[PDB]
Amino acid sequence: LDPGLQPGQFSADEAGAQLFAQSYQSSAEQVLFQSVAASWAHDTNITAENARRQEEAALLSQEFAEAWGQKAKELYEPIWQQFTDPQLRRIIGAVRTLGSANLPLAKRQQYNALLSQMSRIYSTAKVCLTATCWSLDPDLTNILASSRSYAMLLFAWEGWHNAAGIPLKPLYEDFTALSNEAYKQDGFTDTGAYWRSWYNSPTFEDDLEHLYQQLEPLYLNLHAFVRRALHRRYGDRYINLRGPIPAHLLGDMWAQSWENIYDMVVPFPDKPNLDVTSTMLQQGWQATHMFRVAEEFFTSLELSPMPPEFWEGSMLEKPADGREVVCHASAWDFYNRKDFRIKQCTRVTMDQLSTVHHEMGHIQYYLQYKDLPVSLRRGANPGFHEAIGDVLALSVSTPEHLHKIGLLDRVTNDTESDINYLLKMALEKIAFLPFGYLVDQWRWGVFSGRTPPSRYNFDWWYLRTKYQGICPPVTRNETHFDAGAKFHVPNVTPYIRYFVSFVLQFQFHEALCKEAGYEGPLHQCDIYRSTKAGAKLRKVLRAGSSRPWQEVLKDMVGLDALDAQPLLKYFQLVTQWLQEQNQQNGEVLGWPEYQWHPPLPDNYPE
Ligand X SMILES: *[C@@H]1O[C@H](CO[C@@H]2O[C@@H](C)[C@@H](O)[C@@H](O)[C@@H]2O)[C@@H](O[C@@H]2O[C@H](CO)[C@@H](O[C@@H]3O[C@H](CO)[C@@H](O)[C@H](O)[C@@H]3O)[C@H](O)[C@H]2NC(C)=O)[C@H](O)[C@H]1NC(C)=O
Ligand Y SMILES: *[C@@H]1O[C@H](CO[C@@H]2O[C@@H](C)[C@@H](O)[C@@H](O)[C@@H]2O)[C@@H](O)[C@H](O)[C@H]1NC(C)=O
Ligand Z SMILES: *[C@@H]1O[C@H](CO)[C@@H](O[C@@H]2O[C@H](CO)[C@@H](O)[C@H](O)[C@H]2NC(C)=O)[C@H](O)[C@H]1NC(C)=O
Ligand U SMILES: CCCC[C@H](N[C@@H](CCc1ccccc1)C(=O)O)C(=O)N[C@@H](Cc1c[nH]c2ccccc12)C(=O)O
Under the rule (CB under 6 A), what is the footprint of ligand U? 256-257, 328-331, 354-355, 358-359, 386, 428, 432, 491, 493, 498
Site for Mg ion in 260-279 (CB under 5 A): 260
> Which of ligand Z, Zn ion, Cl ion, none sits in contact with 386, Cβ below 5 to 8 A by type?
Zn ion
Distance CA 461, CA 469 (A): 10
Containing 584, the helix (H) or strand (E) segment is helix 565-584
Distance in angstroms between the alpha carbons of the first and the last residue of the chain: 57
CB of 563 to ligand X, least distance (A): 20
Site for ligand X in 480-539 (CB under 6 A): 519-521, 524
Distance CA 261, CA 266 (A): 9
Decide: is 207 part of the binding site for ligand X (CB under 6 A): no
Q: Return the range that interacts with Mg ion (CB under 5 A); candidates 196-204, 287-295, 344-352, 422-430.
A: 344-352
CB of 596 to ligand Y, least distance (A): 15
Other C-beta atoms within 10 Å of 413: how many?
11
Nearer to Zn ion, 62 or 501 (CB): 501
| Phi and psi angles of residue 471, each rounded to the nearest 5 degrees, phi first | -140, 150
SS3 for 470?
Answer: strand
CA 505 → CA 209, 226, 315, 385, 526, distances in Å?
A: 18, 24, 27, 10, 14
Selecting among 359, 428, 510, 587, the annotated active-site residue is 359
Respond yes or no: is residue 488 known to be catalytic.
yes
Distance CA 398, CA 411 (A): 10
Check: CB of residue 516 under 8 Å from CB of residue 527: yes
Q: Which residue is nearest to ligand X (CB)?
A: 520
CB of 395 to ligand X, least distance (A): 11
Site for ligand X in 398-457 (CB under 6 A): 400, 413
CB of 556 to Cl ion, least distance (A): 20
Query: Which residue among 475, 519, 586, 602 contacts ligand Y (CB under 6 A)?
Result: 475
> Which of Zn ion, ligand U, ligand Z, none sits in contact with 355, Cβ below 5 to 8 A by type?
ligand U
Tell me how long the chain is.
Answer: 606
Respond yes or no: is residue 289 known to be catalytic.
no
> Which of Mg ion, ligand Y, ligand Z, none sits in contact with 515, Cβ below 5 to 8 A by type?
none
CA 542 → CA 18, 269, 367, 502, distances in Å?
A: 21, 43, 9, 21
Distance CA 132, CA 144 (A): 18
Q: Return the range that interacts with ligand Y (CB under 6 A); candidates 142-150, 421-429, 472-480, 584-592.
A: 472-480
Distance CA 419, CA 417 (A): 5
> Which of ligand Z, Zn ion, ligand Y, none sits in contact with 526, Cβ below 5 to 8 A by type?
none
Distance CA 488, CA 15 (A): 41
CB of 177 to ligand U, least distance (A): 22
Decide: is 349 part of the binding site for Mg ion (CB under 5 A): yes
Query: Which residue among 439, 474, 512, 527 contacts ligand Y (CB under 6 A)?
Result: 474
Query: Which residue among 186, 351, 400, 555 contacts Mg ion (CB under 5 A)?
Result: 351
CB of 167 to ligand Y, least distance (A): 14
The dihedral of CA 209, 564, 571, 266: what is its sign? negative
Whether a cis peptide bond, with omega within 30° of 0, leads into 452 is no
Decide: is 390 part of the binding site for Zn ion (CB under 5 A): no
Decide: is 494 part of the binding site for Cl ion (CB under 5 A): yes
Closest alpha carbon to 524 in 509, 537, 536: 509
Nearer to Zn ion, 424 or 497 (CB): 497
> Which of ligand Z, ligand X, Mg ion, none sits in contact with 351, Cβ below 5 to 8 A by type?
Mg ion
CB of 42 to ligand Z, least distance (A): 9
Check: CB of residue 101 under 8 Å from CB of residue 66: yes
Residue ranges for the binding site for Zn(2+)? 358, 362, 386
CA 303 → CA 47, 363, 535, 565, distances in Å?
A: 37, 11, 8, 28
Here's the x/- map for ligand Z, 23-62, by CB under 6 A: it reads as ----------------------x-x-xx------------
Nearer to ligand Y, 471 or 513 (CB): 471
CB of 563 to Mg ion, least distance (A): 30
Distance CA 102, CA 115 (A): 17
CA 455 → CA 143, 270, 366, 376, 445, distances in Å?
A: 30, 49, 39, 38, 10
Containing 331, the helix (H) or strand (E) segment is strand 330-333
> Which of Cl ion, Zn ion, ligand Y, none sits in contact with 190, Cβ below 5 to 8 A by type?
none
Residue ranges for the binding site for chloride? 199, 497
Residue ranges for the binding site? 199, 358, 362, 386, 497
> Which of ligand Y, Cl ion, Mg ion, none sits in contact with 494, Cβ below 5 to 8 A by type?
Cl ion
Site for ligand Z in 315-344 (CB under 6 A): 323
SS3 for 342?
Answer: strand
Site for ligand Y in 510-529 (CB under 6 A): none
| Phi and psi angles of residue 333, each rounded to the nearest 5 degrees, phi first | -110, 120
Check: CB of residue 482 under 8 Å from CB of residue 472: yes
Site for ligand X in 362-401 (CB under 6 A): 400
Q: What is the dihedral of CA 392, 395, 396, 402, to 10 degrees?
A: -170
Burial class (CB in 10 A: 0-12, 13-18, 19+), 520: exposed
Query: Which residue among 479, 576, 583, 585 contacts ligand Y (CB under 6 A)?
Result: 479
Query: Which residue among 424, 480, 497, 509 contacts Cl ion (CB under 5 A)?
Result: 497
Selecting among 231, 289, 403, 488, the annotated active-site residue is 488
Q: Which residue is nearest to ligand Z (CB)?
A: 49
Which residue numbers come right before each break in the chain (C to N over 2.5 Å)?
129
Decide: is 469 part of the binding site for Cl ion (CB under 5 A): no
Distance CA 354, CA 543 (A): 25
Nearer to Zn ion, 88 or 500 (CB): 500
Interacting residue ranges for ligand X, rule: CB under 6 A? 400, 413, 519-521, 524
Interacting residue ranges for Cl ion, rule: CB under 5 A? 382, 494, 497
Active site residues per annotation: 359, 488
Interacting residue ranges for Mg ion, rule: CB under 5 A? 260, 349, 351
Interacting residue ranges for ligand Y, rule: CB under 6 A? 474-475, 477, 479
Interacting residue ranges for ligand Z, rule: CB under 6 A? 45, 47, 49-50, 323
